[PDB]
Amino acid sequence: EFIDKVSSYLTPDVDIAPISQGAAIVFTTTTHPYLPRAKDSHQKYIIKYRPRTLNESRLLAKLYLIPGLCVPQLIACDPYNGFIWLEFLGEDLPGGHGFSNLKNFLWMHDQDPYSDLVATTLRKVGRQIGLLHWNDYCHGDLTSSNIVLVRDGARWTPHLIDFGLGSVSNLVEDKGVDLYVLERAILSTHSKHAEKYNAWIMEGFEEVYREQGAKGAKKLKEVTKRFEEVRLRGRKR
């Protein structure tokens, strides 16, 4: 019934392919929502439908304006019917290893992760989270599926997606919980290398804060302390 309603809303002139359904439904389309045919610049786009859309759209727009932060373009918003159209980020990994989110990238490299490529990519993931928190934003659902790698030649450029549960916030408690959710998501694969991955991510996070002089150093101490407290309160005592 969702398919009926969406295709009726869009009309038959907009192709759609469902790719994900959670507790929002996500499609891809080759049709740009407003540029004349062939005057757009990308092969495909994302349509995110909520049968909240406003919150996510507002956060995507605010984050784009922050130097260094990598988020998908907000192309169109219909808050009356619950549609957001976004830039499609990422691609299929070679060898059938899946969509280029962080989870799949780590699985692909899990037998041999000690490379410049893996360490550097994970440090860049941490930099994104560091920029987000430095600027007093919170992701709210920071798993390895919500970090998407975009190919840049032989490198990967981490982007953040899914700001449905995001917020503006200068609370260190919010920051620690974001970090803890990612740490646990990464640990949950049971990989022998999961601790090292989290270590590389934290290196990138810390680098961002230390680039902000004495003020950054003080703020970082605050965050890391709270993060340690969250870890303690995270398991049975």
Add this chain to the structure above:
Amino acid sequence: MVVSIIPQFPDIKVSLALFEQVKNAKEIRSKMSFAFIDPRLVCSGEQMYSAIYKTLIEVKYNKMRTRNLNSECVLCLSPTSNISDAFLKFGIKDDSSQLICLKFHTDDVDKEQLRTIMTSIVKGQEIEFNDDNLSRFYDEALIRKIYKLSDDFKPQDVNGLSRALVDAIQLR
């Protein structure tokens, strides 16, 4: 000139034309169906089309605020909701030397007739409505003031600037 459709609104056509060396902007204003838009505030087709999209979403699914679709689209170019402010800032001015001529068509549009009508109104030279030509006439400093962009925002190119304007349009 270009005639376009928004995919989910198949029966509405929009015509867009760009003019330079305009000599009679004051006259046009005094005789103000078309919208006459100041290209100093328009850096790309992406930005213009995003406002056309917003116009149709607002009118179909929320509330039209102004007289017609042409005027509603001028409002939808603005980051804020004061109608008079939008008309003043995004509409042509007495000193305008270029303009965008926009019209919503709610059959197939008679193009020869349309060109004749536009030429009877505008004293100036039509050029192609495209990004190469829009890139000649936008004023980044003015855009930054009107869309309230921070100096810390430093796009490397027009696409980067356009993306911020589209954001403002979609979230108005």
